[PDB]
Each structure stands twice: as structure tokens, then as C-alpha cells.
Symmetry: C4
Subunit: 332 residues, 4 copies
């Protein structure tokens, strides 16, 4: 595989159409899904030349741990849909690559089993009608050694997934929510989580500048600037279009991650040049899992690491910090 | 039907080609028709997160009545072209949905019959060569319980409808103007109408900012920012491109509606975020009428209501007022 | 014929391919040719409503004569290529429509014969290696009753017409330059012409603002803002993109015409709203001549007059002056 | 051949697919490759009229020598891939046209043999792991009569060429690096070269404004504003998009060349109007070499010279200096 796009072709060959559509699809007309890609394609980097590249490093420190790349595996529900080893296959590959893996509230293997794989696991939280269940998940995650709580704030309820409605998609009987209904979360919910854990709380799905600022004021350790991969509000701005403004507004008060459409090391470099601390990658990780299980995810992460290192050095950056100081230009 | 676009396919299957073209078409090269869609597609919403959504309401108060959604059925001439029940089928579905229905001067069922259906009917006025006939229509509408007069100001004469000219389109003998020639209207005409009724006068087809201001000064209760669905001046700016500027200029002095190309609850949300009080929807209502009569219109209005509620809540808006405070970003 | 585009189809059916290509083609990659159209398509008009339209008039006064529309027939060489009656067919139709016709230096019927048709003829001048020949043409034109000299300033030599080179195009033996080598013209040439005639001198092919200003200072009575229909410099800006700036800079000091890609009454309205005094129309007139001779040109001019009147009134303009006061908005 | 695009078709017919792909391809998704073209296509020139064109000259003085056009042949590795005469065929045609030819460090004929052809040769330098080898190349180039050292600064290592990876491309046994591993170059390397030669040092692959300024401060005699034809960082801005800003920042302190996508005399004119001293042309020269050897390159250079002269005069420029004073407008 020489690009992330070779894996999409392979995943489409193997998965049942309705599962491929659950993975690929977005809400509504899929305008936000498409715009995630368009928005990245319009960003060009202004590389620097003739800098010292004797020891290029792609590592970052985030949430108190060193990561091998400025990237983590995004939360994706129900990974046994894609391969029988599901979350364990992905978590193992992420561990071996030194990349954080986000364990989902809707994981198809229990969070404690996935955490036992090792590595840098984070835990993604959905707020539930029964509040106590959400807070018990947080405590379970912490007890299992998760290192951050990624609170998803953009799903008061699931968006309108027309592919899924047209297909009549439902989980097969062999895939369940192994940790066991959505309730709208509020800033009060954020505070209840912050009070119940010593782990950094990361709010995922922030797009308004004033929500980024309020996240810092609320004691968040990070945010993920994100439109949920075009799966929630159809017509929501891409995160990459808000990122620069958000990074300026928080002025270092929390980590600022971005996601949506990251498909190469070059895209990682764009995100960092716009100011991101790190990116999340969702669909491509699942393409690799579908295509070739743990080995497939390993191969994807190896390719991404090579592309990140290549892009960084070609742009004159010996570190991710230097990459954040790059300028960009919008084009056609 | 899971989107408004499923109904277009169904209407195209059933209607005679020349009737489908009377409905779908615009003037000239159809540049303004296409631009209505392009203009909406370029607008992205910046949603807010973590707000209280315990009681999301899509209702608005407009022209002294509560409406279920920030939407009304646009005036569309000759609805018996599309289904034998014509305007009565649409008006009944609108009533049942709590949406205002605009009875047309060129209705194929008499305005008094349509008004007898009940609901929130408005009445659309064309100025006629015989002035007295226009003013008699106003009095008839008021006597029948219509709640606003929507004075169409963008049709001094009908535009050049090339599909209709190529098809040699004419009304079948079984479709007539049941209320019974266009004369250019002026500001004097507006004043003659205002003096002849106690109902709110709404000027439909305003696109220049200074015409919006003058509408307020003239005593209008509302305007509809509109290029008549691309059917009048070919090359007229889309209403959605003028809306923000217009809303700022009138600074709350009248209701500011918009139309043209509204095809989802997401589009309704864009219009409100740009400042609209409400939208009109034309062609999609007729697609539903063609496809399945009253039931079809009911299904469309149910789908739109679900999409509006979904979009609002995903954007952190418990009310339409909150949606008007959302920011937007233009994209690709 | 219900649009100018119906005539292109008809002309393409009848003309030999190499003649159609001589007519349609531009220089180089035809980037400027295509951009003439793109540039007009991006301009939207902001129409005004509720104005008096009791006596809409499309007339203008230009170069001391009343014209029926704000349009003239552009200079096009060798019109016997397109129809056996050539320039006489076009000139007769223009006369009957009350539109000025520009007689070309490279006319395939002598300028005196065309002028004898009557009407409002103008004369287009090429500067020649033998200066005296150019100045004799001017005197001949004036003696024959031409009312303006349109000095073409953008053809120091003919551009690179790749269609013509690929086709090996040459004039058939039955088409000649009936008035009988290009020399670069300079401001000195302009002055020599101005001194040799009492007619208004119009400089055709101006695109830089400072050249427009200098034209006024040089005593020009008009300019034509133009990239020669994309036939000269490939990559020259469209005239329509320079027009507003030019109109502001000359601040009424001469008439400012535009050409390139005008294909409807709506396009005429755009040009006027951008500030043009009038437009020239080239290729469409020749399509009509190819399709149906004098009658074809008459039909085209009738259609254009109807479209201009329609566009004007739909935009709230009772006169061309009012149309010049319209605002525009650039779109997608 | 009447355009540079006729030669691409001819080269694609004759070359083995993998060699055509080595030539045509870029890094990654080829976003930067495509953007080089897009960026030029959006630039329109504002031509001037009515200037003296009695003695139009396309000559420039650069690096102490007169060149026939504001263009040089870009460094392209391994030209025996394209034709058996390789670099000697191209160098001979360049000499005969009065265009500088850049001899490559990776030339498939030795630099001394190519320099013996005569003409204006420049020498392109790669910095090597063994520094002394790079500096020996510089001395060899100077001893052989090369007139400038073009130090390539954008290849700390070769980019990710996915066409080449998919094809399993490798040099055939009959093509070698005849002058005989990449090491990242730094500003220290630049200074080591500057100290080892009296020739002008030209830094090729500059895109950041501050790197342009530093190049001047470092004693460079020129820079080439360039993204290496889209072959290095995928997502690097096109040079043509940085050029104006760069030209302003150096304010005449060194020659500022540009490359990437130059495919006509019209494109040369755009580059000069944006401020370039001269352009480099890569792929088209190799298309001509593949198609017809020395004669093919001669024909290409003749066509380019004709197009440059044509564009200049149509734009009212009797000299390249005048062309640099032209204004431009971005379009669609
Ligand atoms: C199939 C699928 C399931 C997902 N499930 C979740 C989830 O349970 N929680 C969450 O916060 N995000 C979820 N996401 C969103 C991703 O975390 C991420 O925001 C999105 O996929 C990023 O875009 P990318 O897929 O373009 O890389 C899901 C995304 C996909 C494609
Ligand atoms: C077939 C048809 C007939 C119409 N008749 C009228 C009319 O009689 N009066 C009027 O004010 N608008 C009329 N309109 C315009 C609509 O009220 C509305 O401005 C336009 O359809 C809105 O755009 P939409 O169809 O894209 O939703 C008509 C539109 C269509 C498509
Ligand atoms: C076939 C052809 C021949 C032309 N000959 C002349 C000419 O002799 N003199 C001149 O000033 N313009 C000439 N023009 C340019 C036109 O006057 C005009 O600038 C151009 O056609 C306007 O664009 P349009 O064809 O898009 O309407 C010619 C154009 C065409 C298409
Ligand atoms: C096949 C190929 C090989 C190249 N080899 C070199 C090289 O050895 N050194 C270098 O500085 N540039 C090299 N370049 C880049 C060119 O010098 C130039 O920057 C690029 O081709 C310019 O773009 P153009 O090909 O679009 O005209 C190469 C380009 C191509 C296409
Ligand atoms: O995007 C998803 O599918 C998840 O976030 C879910 F299942 F929660 F909506
Ligand atoms: O758009 C329409 O068809 C109506 O507004 C009419 F019939 F009046 F022009
Ligand atoms: O555009 C044209 O063909 C004319 O202007 C000519 F023939 F002069 F170049
Ligand atoms: O672009 C190229 O192929 C050259 O610059 C090389 F071979 F050095 F990378």
C-alpha cells in the first residue's frame, strides 16, 4: 500500500455494502463530508528550506505522554463490523506504533479488554439519559488506565444517516455495545465529568470560537475541532476551516486537535501548520482493519509515519513545533 | 421518502414532461435558478454545542399567528396541473402541519374554497391592468379569513420561460384561473393596497437593500427576499446572497423571509442563521403533490419538520431565535 | 429561435468546419475566449422593483445619433465567408433594426456599397504599413457617410489562431478584401486620424485603465473595452472584468463600450449595470447570417431587442440610464 | 507543432509508460503538480496598447550573459531516458537558440562533455553526504566553463513518487549518473559553495518570502521560486503564487526566476508580469527531446520564441523590462 487510498479500495472490495456505507457515509446530502476534503485540498503549505534536519522527530508530548506522531486513532463505534478482531486489532497496532487509541463508549469489545492491550489508550464518552451510567464509564476508564476522557459534545442525538436509512442498516446480532439512550450534554455535564476524574477532559466536536474559549474556561485539557466526519449536522463547517481562528483564540490554554478528512502525512502537515497540536484519523484506520486486520492497521500507521516524516523534512521542520510555525496559503 | 430529493424523482416519473418543465424551469439560460442552489451550498453553519435542548421548539410567531415551523408554502400558480385535488390537497396538508399556505391570485380552485379548508391561509396578489380587480381580490381574501397579503412585486410581466416556449406549453382546458392582464406595480400600488386592508402587507420579490428599506418605510409588515425561483430576471442575484445585508438594513422593522432553493431542514437552518424570519418552499411542495396528493404533501411537511428540528438541535438551538444568532462561513 | 444559442447550432450545421472555426476560434489555448463567458456568468444583477414602467425605452444617443438598443454590430472581417450576401445582408438588417453596423477595413464588399445601404454605419480602421492607405480609408468612410471611426488598437499583428493553423485555413478565391500589411499603431497614429476627420474616433481594444484615461486625453470620443473576442493576446483579461474600473477612471469623458461574449439581453443588462454606454456583438450576428441571411440577422436583432426590454423592465429600468445605475454582485 | 501540447502527445506515443510516468509524475496525490497549472490559468494579463513596437526584443542579460529569451532549460536528471543523445541533443539545441541550458548533477552524459557543446551552460548542484564530492562538482563545473551554479535546495531527499513506486521504476542499465547519497543542505552549505567559486550561486526551490530575503543576505545571485514541478512536497504552494510577494521582498537584490507549468509564451509573459527575471522550462523540453531529438528541441525553442515575441507585442512590450511592468488580474 503506497497511499491511504489503496486501503479504501481494498476495504470496499471486502465489506458488505451496507457496512461500507455505515463507515463511509455522512448525514443529509453529505455536504459536510465532502467539504472536509475540499477544505484540506485548498490549503497549501509554504515550506522552508536549508534548515538542519539531522534529527527529524515526529514525536509530540500530549496529555502527559509521548506519542510517536501528532496523531491518534479517532473514536469509531462497533469495530467488529469491520473485522472479527475489531478494537483489539486496532489497539494492538496503535500500541506498537506508539499512537494513542481512542476506546469508544460504543466499543464492540469491552473497554477493560481493550485497555489491557496496553499502549496509550484514551476513552471517548457519550452522555447518556442515565447520567450515572456515563459517570460510571468514566470511572471504569480511569480504573483501567485510560489517560484522557474524550467527551463527544456534538451528538445530542445521532444525525440523519440517509445511506443507513436507505439500506435499512442494523447491527448484526454478533456485534453489540460491549460496555453495557443518548442525552444532550451541557456545560453542566462537562463540569460533572471534570469533578469525577483527574484525567484531562477533551471536548470533541467544537467548531465555534466562543465554544473553544469556554472549553478552556471550563477546565478542558483539549478540544477536537471537528464536524464528526460529516455525520452530524449536514452543513456544519469543516473543522479545518475553523482551526486557525480557534488556535488563536485559545492562545495555548489547551491542546487543539482537528479531524475530518486527514488522508496523508501531507494533510497532517497542513493541520499542524494551521496550528493543530495533533490530528485524529477515523475512516482510513477502519479501511486498513477491514482490508487486513491488525497487520493492515500496522501497515497504515507505518505509511502515515513515513509520510509525516517526509512532509516535515521537505518543509524544513525538524520537529512538530517547527511545523506549527509554517505558513499556509489558500489556493484553488 | 427520506429527503426532498426522493419526491422530485417521483414527480418526474408521473407528470407529463411539459408540466414538469413548467414547474422546474426558469427564465433565460436558468442562471438564476441554478445560482439559488449554488448560493445555499456555499453557506456553512458554525454550530454551537452543549446548550440546553430539553424543549427544542421549531415554532415562530408571524403576522399574529403561531406557525409550527419557520416556513410557509410559497405561492405557486395552477396547482391542478400537478394533481386533481390541486390547491385543496396542499392547503389541507399545510393546515394539518401548522404551516401557512399562500393562496395564489392564479389559483385553479377559488380562493374562498381554499380558505374554507382552514389553517393559516395567506393570499398572494398580482397587480392587474384593471386595478379594481386587484383591490377586489384583496377584499375577497380578507373577507375569507386570509391573514396576510403577499404582494408579488417582481412580475411586471412574466419572464421568458424558454422551456415553455420550446414545448408550446399552454394550460389544459380543465385548468383555469378560478378567481376570475398583469400590470406593472409601483409604490403607489403598495400604498393603495395598504389603505384597502388591515392585514399585514408582505412584498415578495425584493432584492435591493434600498427596496427593503423603502418597504419598511411604506408600512410593509414583511418582505420576501427572492428572485422568484429563477423565473423572472435571468441573472438576478439569489435572495440568499442579499439576505444578510437586507436583514441588517431593516434592523427589525419588518419580517424578512427568503426563498429559492430551500430543499432541506439544513437549508432552513442556513436561512435562519443568515437572519431570515422564515422561508417559503415552492417546487418541493408541488413534487409531493404530484407524487402522492395530500398524503404526499403531508409526508414532505413531516420530513421537513423532522429535518428542521434535527438541524436546530445539532446546532445547539432550542428556538428559532437562537438559530438566527448562529454564525456562518462561506466555503467552496 | 428563442435564444442566441439556437442560432449557433444552426450555423454550425451549415458552415464548412474550417469557416466555423475561423469564426468561433481564439488565439492560443483559447483561455481569453472562454474567460469572456465565465466573466459574464459570474456577474449577477440586483434588480429594482416597483418603478414606473409605463414607457420603457431601450434607446440611446451615441456619437450624435439615436440607436434603438445600447448595442452595435461588431466589426467582423470577410462576412461573405458566412453567406453570399455577406455585409450587405447584415447591414440591411441592422439598418432596419435601428442598430449601428460597423463596416470593416477587411470587408468583403466595398465600404461605399455597404454605406449605401443606409442606417447608422460606423467604420473600423486597421493601421497599415502604408500609412496613407489607412488615412485614405478614413476619408473614404467619411465621404460615404460613416458616423464614427472605430480604430482597432489591439492588432499590431494578428494573434496565433491555432484552429486556423491546424486547418490550413485560407480565404476562398471568391472572398477578397474589397476595400483594396498590418502596422503597429501608436498614439501618434491616433492623433493623425483625429486630425484627418471630424468624426468621433473610438479606440477598440483598450483594457488598461491608464490607456482608457489616455484615450480621453487624446480626444477619443469613445473606447471599446475588449480583448478582441479572445483572438489576440491569449491570457488577456476580459473587457467585462476591467469595465467598472475604466468607467470610473474616465468619469464621463468618453463613451465606454464593451464586448466579448454578449449572448443575451440579460448580458446587455449586466454590461450596462457595470457602466457600459453600449455593447458590441460579433459572433452571434454571424451565426444568424450563416443560418438565414438577412432574415436571420433580423430575427436575431428582434430577439435581442425583446430580451433587452424584458431584462430592463424586470430590473426596474425604464431607460438605459437607469440600467447604468443598477448594482451588481459577483457570485459562483 | 503549433503548441507545446502537440509535443506532449508525441512524447507519450513513443516513450515506454514507466519513463513517461517518471517524467510526468509528481509526489503524493500530485496536488502541487496540478496546482502549478491551475495557478497560471487564473492569472490574466492587462495588456497595453499603442506603444512603439519597431524593435521588439525578447533578450535579457542574466548572470553576465545575454540570453535570447527570458528562459532557460530547467535541470532534468537522466535525459538519456528520453532519447539516446540525451543531454547533448538538448544542450546543442539550447546553444543554437541562445537559451541557457542547466547541466544536472545527475546528468547521463558527463558535465564536461555537455559543457563542450558550448552555449551558456549553467550547472545544477545536489549536496551530497560526501561534502567534498559536491564541492569537487562545483570546481569541475567552473573549470568546464559553466556560468552559474544552480544549487537545488528543496531535495534533502527525493519526494514520494507514487507512479514510480507503482511501476517499480528503476534506471535501465544503459543510463547512469555520468558525473560519478543526497544530504540535507543548509545555509552553511550555501556559504561553503559561495566561498569555493566566483560564479553566481542561484538557489533553486525557494518558496517562503523570508527564505528569499535570506538568500539575498547570503550572497545569492539569484533564486528560482519553485515547488520542483510538484515532485517534492505534495501540498507545497506553486512558485507562481509566491512570486509577486518574493519579488517585492528582494527589491532587486538578486535575479528572481520561477518555474512550474510554463507551457507557452503567454505563460512566460504572465511570469514576467508577476516580476520574474526569467523562467525555467522542464517537462516540455523533454517531450520535444523524446519526440524528435535535437531537432525536436530546436522546434520547441523556436515555437516558444515566436510565442514570447507574439505575447509581448500584443501586450505592448518592446522589451522584457516593459513586460515586468505589466499588471495582472486574478480570474476564474
Ligand atoms: C463509522 C464511524 C463511527 C464513529 N463513531 C464515533 C463515536 O462513537 N464517537 C465519536 O466521538 N466519534 C465517532 N466517529 C467520528 C470520528 O471520531 C471522527 O470525528 C471522524 O471519523 C473523523 O473523520 P475521518 O473519518 O474523516 O478521519 C465515527 C466516525 C465513523 C466514520
Ligand atoms: C410553477 C411555479 C409557479 C409559481 N407561481 C407564482 C405566483 O403565481 N406568484 C408568485 O408570487 N410566485 C410564484 N412562484 C414563485 C414561488 O412563489 C417561489 O418564489 C419560488 O418557487 C421559490 O423557489 P423554490 O421553488 O425554489 O422553493 C411560482 C413558482 C413556480 C415554480
Ligand atoms: C471572425 C471574426 C473576425 C473579426 N474581425 C475583426 C476586425 O476585422 N476588426 C476588429 O476590430 N475586430 C474584429 N473582430 C473582433 C470583434 O469585433 C469583437 O471584438 C469580438 O468578436 C467580440 O466578441 P463576440 O464575438 O464574443 O461578441 C472579429 C471577430 C471575429 C469573431
Ligand atoms: C523528470 C524530472 C527530473 C528532474 N530532475 C531535477 C534535478 O535533477 N534537479 C533539479 O534541481 N530539478 C529537477 N527537476 C525539476 C525541474 O528542474 C523543474 O523545477 C520542474 O520540472 C519545472 O517544472 P516544469 O517541468 O513544469 O516546467 C526535474 C523535473 C523532472 C520533470
Ligand atoms: O457517528 C457515529 O456513528 C457515532 O458517533 C454514533 F454511532 F454515535 F452516532
Ligand atoms: O412564476 C409563475 O409562473 C407565476 O409567478 C406567473 F405565472 F405569474 F408568472
Ligand atoms: O480577428 C480577426 O480575424 C481580425 O481582427 C483580423 F482578421 F484582423 F485579425
Ligand atoms: O526530481 C527529480 O527526479 C530529481 O530532482 C531527483 F531525481 F533528484 F529527485
Amino acid at each position: 500500500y503506497v497511499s491511504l487510498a489503496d486501503l479504501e479500495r481494498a476495504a470496499r472490495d471486502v465489506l458488505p455494502g451496507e457496512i461500507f456505507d455505515f463507515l463511509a457515509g455522512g448525514s443529509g446530502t453529505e455536504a459536510s463530508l465532502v467539504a472536509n476534503r475540499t477544505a484540506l485540498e485548498r490549503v497549501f503549505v509554504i515550506p522552508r528550506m536549508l534548515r538542519d534536519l539531522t534529527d527529524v522527530t515526529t514525536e509530540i508530548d500530549i496529555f502527559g505522554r509521548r506519542a510517536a506522531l501528532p496523531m491518534a486513532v479517532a473514536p469509531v463505534a462497533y469495530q467488529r463490523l469491520f473485522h472479527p478482531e475489531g478494537e483489539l486489532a486496532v489497539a494492538r497496532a496503535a500500541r506498537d506504533a506508539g499512537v494513542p487509541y481512542t476506546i469508544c463508549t460504543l466499543s464492540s469489545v469491552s473497554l477493560e479488554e481493550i485497555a489491557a492491550v496496553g499502549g496509550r489508550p484514551w476513552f471517548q464518552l457519550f452522555w447518556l439519559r442515565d447520567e450515572k451510567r456515563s459517570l460510571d464509564l468514566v470511572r471504569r476508564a480511569e480504573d483501567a488506565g485510560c489517560e484522557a476522557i474524550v467527551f463527544t459534545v456534538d451528538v445530542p442525538w445521532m444525525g440523519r444517516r440517509l445511506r443507513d436509512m436507505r439500506n435499512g442498516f442494523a447491527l448484526p446480532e454478533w456485534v453489540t455495545a460491549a460496555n453495557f439512550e443518548f442525552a444532550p450534554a451541557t456545560w453542566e455535564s462537562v463540569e460533572a465529568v471534570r469533578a469525577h476524574t483527574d484525567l484531562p477532559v477533551v471536548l470533541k466536536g467544537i467548531l465555534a470560537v466562543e465554544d473553544a474559549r469556554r472549553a478552556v474556561d471550563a477546565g478542558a485539557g483539549g478540544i477536537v475541532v471537528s464536524n464528526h466526519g460529516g455525520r452530524q449536522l449536514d452543513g456544519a463547517v469543516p473543522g479545518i476551516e475553523m482551526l486557525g481562528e480557534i488556535v488563536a483564540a485559545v492562545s495555548g490554554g489547551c491542546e487543539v486537535l482537528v479531524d475530518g478528512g486527514i488522508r496523508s502525512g501531507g494533510d497532517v502537515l497542513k493541520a499542524t501548520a494551521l496550528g493543530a497540536s495533533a490530528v485524529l484519523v477515523g475512516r482510513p484506520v477502519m479501511w486498513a482493519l477491514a482490508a487486513a486486520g491488525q497487520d493492515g492497521v500496522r501497515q497504515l500507521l507505518e505509511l502515515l509515519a513515513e509520510e509525516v516524516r517526509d512532509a516535515m523534512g521537505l518543509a524544513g521542520c525538524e520537529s512538530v513545533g517547527a511545523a506549527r510555525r509554517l505558513n499556509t496559503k489558500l489556493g484553488v
